[PDB]
Amino acid sequence: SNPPPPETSNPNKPKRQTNQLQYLLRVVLKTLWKHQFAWPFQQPVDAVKLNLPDYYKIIKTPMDMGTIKKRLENNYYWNAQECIQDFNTMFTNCYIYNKPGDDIVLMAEALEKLFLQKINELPTEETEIMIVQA
Ligand SMILES: O=C(NCc1cccnc1)c1cc(-c2csc3c(=O)cc(N4CCNCC4)oc23)cc2c1OCCO2
């Protein structure tokens, strides 16, 4: 079976918004979301229908841009780097599970290159906008 998707809320985790996290949603995530190769990563992986053996034993932290989107919309992240690591995990999950040079790997690599380019547009100084304590 497929496990439930990753959490996008946590009662013990404070909610936070920064100017960096805003840019990640409005520009970085949006740019990747409109990319030609976004569609395999817009939702959690369906290992059953895709015939991916032992995907959730090897991939212990599944991640997708739909989860990242919901986490940004509901201020799940502590800061921008926690969001960046979800992008990073999404890419490396595909890299460690598939043969280098495979189609899905080429798609992930193209998204990561665009991701690195858009991340360079991030405001260097962090501006906290709001914190909602848990
Ligand atoms: O390829 C996909 N659809 C093929 C297809 C069939 C019919 C019609 N249209 C397209 C595919 C792959 C991932 C996806 C995200 S990560 C990841 C990974 O690590 C390894 C693999 N695979 C699957 C292919 N064999 C190699 C290993 O797929 C993924 C997610 C998806 C996909 O389509 C549906 C939406 O959600």
Numbering used by the authors: 43 to 176
What does the paper say about this structure?
BRD4 contains two bromodomains, BRD4BD1 and BRD4BD2, that recognize acetylated lysine residues in histones and non-histone proteins. Of the four members of the BET family proteins, BRD4 is the most thoroughly characterized, and its aberrant activity has been associated with NUT midline carcinoma, colon, breast and prostate cancers, neuroblastoma, and hematopoietic cancers. BRD4 overexpression has been shown to promote tumor growth by stimulating transcription of major oncogenic drivers, such as MYC. In this study, we report the biological activities and mechanisms of action of thienopyranone (TP)-based inhibitors with increased potency toward BRD4 and selectivity toward BRD4BD1.
Further modification of SRX3212 into SRX3212P yielded the most selective inhibitor capable of distinguishing BRD4BD1 over BRD4BD2 by two orders of magnitude. The carbonyl oxygen in the thienopyranone moiety of all compounds forms a hydrogen bond with the amide nitrogen of Asn140 and a water-mediated hydrogen bond with the hydroxyl group of Tyr97 of BRD4BD1. While the nitrogen atom in the piperazine ring of SRX3212P and SF2523P is unrestrained, the oxygen atom in the morpholine ring of SRX3212 is involved in a water mediated polar interaction with the carboxyl group of Asp144, which likely accounts for a sevenfold increase in potency of SRX3212 compared to SRX3212P. The indole ring of Trp81 flips over ~ 180° in SRX3212 and SRX3212P compared to this ring’s position in SF2523P, enhancing its interaction with the benzodioxane moiety. Unlike the morpholine oxygen, the nitrogen atom in the piperazine group of SRX3212P cannot serve as a hydrogen bond acceptor, and the lack of this contact with His437 may play a role in reducing the binding selectivity of this compound to BRD4BD2. The ability of piperazine-containing compounds SRX3212P and SF2523P to associate and inhibit PI3Kα was also decreased as measured by kinase screening assays. Because SRX3212P is a potent inhibitor of BRD4BD1 but not BRD4BD2 or PI3K, whereas SRX3212 is a potent inhibitor of both BDs and PI3K, we measured and compared cytotoxic activity of these inhibitors in three cyclinD1 dependent mantle cell lymphoma cell lines (Jeko-1, Mino and Z138), a colon carcinoma cell line (HCT116), a MYCN amplified p53 mutated neuroblastoma cell line (SKNBE2) and a PTEN mutated prostate cancer cell line (PC3).
